[PDB]
Amino acid sequence: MNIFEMLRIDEGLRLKIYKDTEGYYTIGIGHLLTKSPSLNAAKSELDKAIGRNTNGVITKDEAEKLFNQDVDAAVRGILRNAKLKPVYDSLDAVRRAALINMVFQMGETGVAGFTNSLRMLQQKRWDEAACNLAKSRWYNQTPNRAKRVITTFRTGTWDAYKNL
Numbered sequence: 001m002n003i004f005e006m007l008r009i010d011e012g013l014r015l016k017i018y019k020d021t022e023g024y025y026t027i028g029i030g031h032l033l034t035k036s037p038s039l040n041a042a043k044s045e046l047d048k049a050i051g052r053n054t055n056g057v058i059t060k061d062e063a064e065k066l067f068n069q070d071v072d073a074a075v076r077g078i079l080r081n082a083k084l085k086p087v088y089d090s091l092d093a094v095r096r097a098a099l100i101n102m103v104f105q106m107g108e109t110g111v112a113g114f115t116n117s118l119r120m121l122q123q124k125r126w127d128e129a130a131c132n133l134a135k136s137r138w139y140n141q142t143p144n145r146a147k148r149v150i151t152t153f154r155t156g157t158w159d160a161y162k163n164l
């Protein structure tokens with residue numbers, strides 16, 4: 001298991017534009033296109049992202065390319081964020097992956113706002129952090145995925161992902 005395999009499990013793989021859990025146009029492995037309710041706007045973003053006239057369909061290689069860029073962006077974002085960097089730096093590789101997962105799903109600013117959870121993580125108060133993380137819109141809207149990510153932070157193991 002690794003951050004790529006983890007996010008692949010959590011995000012799935014779809015080669016045609018689809019709506020994500022929040023109802024936003026997405027493609028590939030959780031590649032958010034736009035928050036706009038316009039399918040045309042989403043197709044424009046897609047074409048720009050891929051560099052060709054796609055008309056809402058991409059190949060597996062293209063999906064994997066956007067995925068690689070998105071994972072890189074999440075990591076890059078964590079490192080440039082004053083709140084996220086110290087937490088990330090303090091964690092082991094498995095827990096680092098859990099933090100990248102959250103950033104991939106909700107964005108740098110979103111995760112940076114989890115002030116209390118971040119402090120507990122920094123303090124290595126694993127059970128306390130896990131309890132705090134669940135007190136969120138995140139957990140309530142995507143509980144199965146949040147449970148996996150939280151288990152990863154609580155245990156520092158890939159237990160939540162090994163049978164998936």
Ligand SMILES: *SCC1=CC(C)(C)N(O)C1(C)C
Nearest residue numbers: 127128130131132133134135
């Ligand atoms: S958040 C910690 C916690 C409190 C209580 C309601 C007793 N629980 O079942 C858990 C372990 C979730």
Ligand SMILES: [Cl-]
Nearest residue numbers: 011012020030
């Ligand atoms: Cl998804």
Ligand SMILES: [Cl-]
Nearest residue numbers: 048049066069
């Ligand atoms: Cl992009």
Ligand SMILES: [Cl-]
Nearest residue numbers: 142143144145
């Ligand atoms: Cl879920």
